[PDB]
Ligand binder design. Structure first.
Ligand SMILES: [Cu+2]
Length: 99
């Protein structure tokens, strides 16, 4: 599934921001508008026993050019909360369900 970082009107959002995938399906996050951006999974808001370090950017890492991507595949089922670190407060948050 492709997820834009930043809406085409420059809104600070994931598009889409809530979605479901099957296990081992790839998510391609692509720098769209309003970057730099990143993708960080909430360690306290993913399935038990998942290593967030395996599926996220560092807080300190950025995608700073149009079209840079980060890709990830999730396998454990459950809900995963993620955010953009610099824009979390702006509401640039999402949630994926692996079902
Ligand atoms: Cu952002």
């Amino acid at each position: 599934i492709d997820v834009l970082l930043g809406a085409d009107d420059g809104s600070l959002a994931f598009v889409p921001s809530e979605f479901s995938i099957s296990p081992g399906e790839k998510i391609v996050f692509k720098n769209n508008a309003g970057f730099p951006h990143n993708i960080v999974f909430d360690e306290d808001s993913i399935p038990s026993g998942v290593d967030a370090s395996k599926i996220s950017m560092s807080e300190e890492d950025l995608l700073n050019a149009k079209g840079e991507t980060f890709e990830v595949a999730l396998s454990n089922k459950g809900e995963y909360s993620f955010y953009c670190s610099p824009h979390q407060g702006a509401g640039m948050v999402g949630k994926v369900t692996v079902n």
